[PDB]
Ligand binder design. Structure first.
Ligand SMILES: O=C1c2c(O)ccc(O)c2C(=O)c2c(NCCNCCO)ccc(NCCNCCO)c21
Ligand SMILES: CC(C)CCC[C@@H](C)[C@H]1CC[C@H]2[C@@H]3CC=C4C[C@@H](O)CC[C@]4(C)[C@H]3CC[C@]12C
Ligand SMILES: CC(C)CCC[C@@H](C)[C@H]1CC[C@H]2[C@@H]3CC=C4C[C@@H](O)CC[C@]4(C)[C@H]3CC[C@]12C
Lengths: 566, 566
């Protein structure tokens, strides 16, 4: 399969104006400065831009590009987006299970995971972890190689590479770039956009397309690239690199004058002659959930640097709160002391789950790459990570928390009340995290994603029945009490706590008491807060919290589905 | 003045082992890969490394290097550390006032601010703001030029440049690098370490010193640099750049073998022959405070993007708190409602001043550069920014705040009580900011500087007399209540608030009342919290808060003074 393209007009201002060229099933290249359409022409051929501003036609071996061209052709993006906290054997296994297991069996597809493991040369680092900025692993020259084989699993006719030697320590650059020539003998069309090649790959170019400032300068093979400028008016004599010279006419030793002789050159008049002649998901849903979770669950425990940091800070906080209110009694300072701690637990769960914004913003460029390549639907990436990084990461600081703080305090020695506290602590922890998930998904920078959290969760802990006595704010702004997660947690934690206690030893304030403004018995404390004493008045909050989850979850699912991924 | 150095042995592993060379009062260069001692040799000649691991002698024109060599010789660091939110006319004025005004007058030194303004060519952008990532200004080619003239004010014999063309859009690279040759005609010795020169400056090198992997490869002028390798065993024929070839022997088309012929070459045997022959603050304190503040105060209002963002979020928070507790009455919900708001004000000041960690961590590399160059003492940089970015930035969210929230609430309609609230709100705001200043000064990354804040200020708002009733925690951990800023704010805000109110209409609970556990009169509310009713018991907190400032300020002054600035 060969690629070709004609009269490509791309507008955002036209960033890619008058570009036409033909590829070969060999090893091609897109050179030039990065300010022009160098990166832009590669995404056009990869169908990675949006097709709105495009005008021309990318004709693949005479056929027009179908909609499943993107699932047939890999695209190694610039930065290493491989899963760093996994092993390269499993890292090739992740893509292999998401694009092949429809009709072939398991051990059938096990062949091509090993068949590609020595053509890359990855057998010496096959069973090692990759390597991140938080951990050490395989060297950086083979972080790029496992990116290449990851899209080599599905059988490619075309293979793009966005700048595959940016930050790769050029002593290691030749072996991967010789390896792309070795793949090209079988028929794999390779169209990369290398960044400042010195000389070593420049002898091994089957074609090249230099592009600068949105104007097509030169397209032709590298052996006849030297013989262009020496009869075109631009002398590159000895002690001058040829791959470095070609951009010096743009540097000024005119912005369109460097390319207008290419219209009247001996390349474009016959390249058009071919172009004027040539112009005449896949895997099941339960399997897609089973693999994005298994990748994410292995990524969770594989880097337990911040996951278990949340565990040990939940243990010692529940020990400190346990040491402070150790054996809190039913004296005068019962309502002041046990409504205080229940305020702290719900607002901490509201505030410790600001870290959930760092969920869809680390792997955002990974998700944009893996959705558009066809690994999974958005409904699989979204649901798969909630079962992996949201359920067994917010459930833990509610049952590790409440087993320590409850009996060390002596709140209410029942068996359901220990459970309707553990349930409502994980109900605010799922609700507040999914709220922080909502207004931070589909974003790249967590500057405003944390700025919009920390000034909004203080617009909620005000309206939470401790600092305010909610039934005393006048009604024209007291409607805001319903739009606040910690009110439902605090009230549900108060309703199962102040129901049998009387904070008043030496008397009884059940039915007969003079000298009011007392609040001796516990239910009178709740009616001053306006919390309903009915048993529905506990579970009124949870069905308001469960609706708070699902409302705030589907806006997060929308923001990933309605995200511009081009 | 000419520089020279002999047998330079630098250990951290020896990063700079056997390097010796001579400079010329011309234009020198330090080439090679960045992994070796390329950047390391420049800091040695600039006396920018620490002199601990150094063994050899940097001999300047036969004299040894004095301790005031660093104030005599500029050093343009790699990144642009000029003040971006100032005008280049004032940007040259800042250095001019800090190193010249001891004996000459003001308008005398005004000559050399203009005398250097056209040799750089900065007259067209003299009265414009420089340019940052938050604002636009002068182009990036002249951001580097104002860095050069900023150390040209004091009369230099020697002038270093750490990589002066890293990210400078090489079409603009020649004019600044031709300008360094134009400065070299007067006698200014220029020793830079340029990064990958292509050819254009390579013809204009008065000397060069290539260095790779801590082993001295070649030192000699560029005209006799070509004639080295063609009789040394390494052929660089036509269509090969000479400045790019010299590192290909390290790339492998042996780590010490490339330099051992330089020991038996026709350069080192006579360079040693000179070396074996040659081996035979300033400005007043009130003026230094007056200029670092004027720079910082102009940097504050010159970029009012986040400064006035704190103002408008203080106004609308004080309006929202004003709208919530609008006219709070003396009913049963008086203690629940007005001790709640006073908890919120002190903890917000404790928590809104987490942004004070972004004070000595933005200009840290600026401070390291400007202290070591001799602009000011550490006591001037530290005190100058407190009078600029700490006084009129935390005073504003305590008098803009308390004028709105006080009379809209109706707290206590005195005239001192409005002031002993405004005083104690700015006492926590200065204390908590200076605590956040303390454990974040002298650091580069605000990851742990915010991580150690947000988990410590919740170890303080627990012990603040609202969630806990401090006199009920057993004494073996209740000693922790003194190590907490918001307890002193909340208590001082409570002591001036609960002193005449009785929250109990229809009765009086002054001296005669049955049916206790009432808390009807306001002073009985304070004695349950253990807050002393004596008038010293208000100001007990402020003299504990003023000692909290000075203790937490001098650890910040220590961390800048005892900071490794090499
Ligand atoms: O925990 C709180 C918090 C709280 O427990 C009770 C009241 C609070 O106001 C907070 C809180 O504010 C908080 C964080 N916010 C800092 C910015 N607040 C500025 C308000 O204008 C930022 C982070 C944060 N918690 C991180 C705790 N780490 C896990 C241990 O539970 C908090
Ligand atoms: C997208 C965002 C802004 C929507 C906010 C979600 C909140 C405000 C919505 C979603 C579900 C709603 C709740 C669902 C049903 C109940 C139970 C009823 O007995 C009291 C009201 C209450 C509790 C509703 C209040 C408003 C509510 C909590
Ligand atoms: C470096 C850090 C850890 C030191 C912490 C500072 C705090 C804990 C120190 C510094 C100054 C000290 C205060 C100064 C004097 C008083 C007034 C006295 O009537 C009560 C104790 C009290 C209030 C001290 C308590 C402890 C104190 C507040």
């Amino acid at each position: 399969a060969v690629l070709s393209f004609h009269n490509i007009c791309y507008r955002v201002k036209e960033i890619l104006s008058n570009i036409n060229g033909i590829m070969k099933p060999g090893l091609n290249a897109i050179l030039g400065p990065t300010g022009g359409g160098k990166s832009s022409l590669l995404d056009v051929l990869a169908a990675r831009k949006d097709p709105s501003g495009l005008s021309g036609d990318v004709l693949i071996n005479g056929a027009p590009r179908p909609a499943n061209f993107k699932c047939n052709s890999g695209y190694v993006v610039q930065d290493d987006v491989v899963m760093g906290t996994l092993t390269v054997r499993e890292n090739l296994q992740f893509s292999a299970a998401l694009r092949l297991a429809t009709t072939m069996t398991n051990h059938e597809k096990n062949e091509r995971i090993n068949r590609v493991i020595q053509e890359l040369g990855l057998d010496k680092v096959a069973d090692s972890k990759v390597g991140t900025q938080f951990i050490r692993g395989v060297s950086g020259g083979e972080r790029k190689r496992t990116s290449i084989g990851m899209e080599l699993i599905t059988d490619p006719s075309i293979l793009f590479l966005d700048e595959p030697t940016t930050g790769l320590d050029s002593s290691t650059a030749n072996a991967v770039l010789l390896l792309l020539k070795r793949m090209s003998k079988q028929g794999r069309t390779i169209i990369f956009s290398i960044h400042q090649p010195r000389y070593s790959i420049f002898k091994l170019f089957d074609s090249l397309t230099l592009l600068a400032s949105g104007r097509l300068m030169f397209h032709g093979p590298a052996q006849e690239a030297l013989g262009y400028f020496e009869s075109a008016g631009y002398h590159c004599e000895a002690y001058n690199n040829p791959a470095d010279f070609f951009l010096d006419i743009i540097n000024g030793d005119l912005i369109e004058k460097l390319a207008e002789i290419y219209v009247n050159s001996s390349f474009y008049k016959e390249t058009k002659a071919e172009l004027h002649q040539l112009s005449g998901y896949t895997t099941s849903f339960c399997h897609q959930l089973r693999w994005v979770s298994k990748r994410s669950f292995k990524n969770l425990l594989g880097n337990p640097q911040a996951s278990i940091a949340q565990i040990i800070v939940t243990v010692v906080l529940g020990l400190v709160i346990g040491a402070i209110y150790f054996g809190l009694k039913n004296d005068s300072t019962g309502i002041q002391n046990r409504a205080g701690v229940l305020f702290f637990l719900t607002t901490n769960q509201c505030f410790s789950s600001v870290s959930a914004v760092e969920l869809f913003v680390v792997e955002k460029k990974l998700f944009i790459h893996e959705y558009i390549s066809g690994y999974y639907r958005v409904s699989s990436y979204f649901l798969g990570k909630l079962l992996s990084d949201l359920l067994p990461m917010r459930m833990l600081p509610s049952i590790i928390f409440t087993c320590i703080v409850y009996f060390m305090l002596g709140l209410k020695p029942k068996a359901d009340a220990f459970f309707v506290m553990m349930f409502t602590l994980m109900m605010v922890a799922y609700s507040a995290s999914s709220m922080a998930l909502a207004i931070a998904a589909g974003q790249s920078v967590v500057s405003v994603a944390t700025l919009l959290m920390t000034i909004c969760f203080v617009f909620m802990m005000i309206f939470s029945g401790l600092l305010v006595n909610l039934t005393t704010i006048a009604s024209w702004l007291s409607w805001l009490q319903y739009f606040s997660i910690p009110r439902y947690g605090f009230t549900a934690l108060q309703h199962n706590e102040f129901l049998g206690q009387n904070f008043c030893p030496g008397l009884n304030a059940t039915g007969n008491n003079p000298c009011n403004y007392a609040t001796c018995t516990g239910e009178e404390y709740l009616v001053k807060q306006g919390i309903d004493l009915s048993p529905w008045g506990l579970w009124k909050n949870h069905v308001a919290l469960a609706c708070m989850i699902v409302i705030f979850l589907t806006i997060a699912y929308l923001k990933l589905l309605f995200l511009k991924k081009y």
